[PDB]
Amino acid sequence: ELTPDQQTLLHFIMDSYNKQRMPQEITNKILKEAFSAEENFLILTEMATNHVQVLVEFTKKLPGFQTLDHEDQIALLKGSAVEAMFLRSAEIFNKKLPSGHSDLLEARIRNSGISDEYITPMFSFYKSIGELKMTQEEYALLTAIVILSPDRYIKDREAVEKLQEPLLDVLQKLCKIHQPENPQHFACLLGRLTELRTFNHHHAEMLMSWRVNDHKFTPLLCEIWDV
């Protein structure tokens, strides 16, 4: 039971979310590249760089984002980059792959210059995400909400927390239609947003590690991740 201004909004969010492709040239490296900390770090860079290019495209095709302040427009984007990437990584990671393709993935994630003290909470988050059995619509909406977060140095807030509002209201209605058995679903979804936010500290810690140990990032990533 969605309203018409809700189905249109949803259809909009879904239209931009389904544009997010990942060139076969980059992904094919997972199945063809050599197993070494460098080649795996190389994959992460190319992927996370394409992700930012596509996330900006998803962000501006958002309803009302373009009707915002050029410093609030870029405030939000700069701020959601890390969260949105790990959320996308959790979504992909949680897809049913064929025989030992998930083991291959997990092996690469490990040998990519990240110390396990972060890897452990990473997989901890992925399983928790996997447990919620999230639909396509919930990932897209969750992504829109993580971007439209009037929190952490945009000046306005009220306007930011006006576009995000019907989004959450749509995310709620969705939780009842598809998971009416579990009425804690909505609370649990927002719950993963909290665990998601904690990734900025861990990400900063891993950044310096690759940094001090001679691992280079693309100029776009240097702007987004602050290097």
Binding site: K60, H70, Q73, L77, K78, P219, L220, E223
Partner: peptide, 10 residues
């Protein structure tokens, strides 16, 4: 900076 504003505008 340069790249982000660029991607946003064009």
């Amino acid at each position: 900076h340069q790249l982000l504003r660029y991607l946003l505008d064009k």
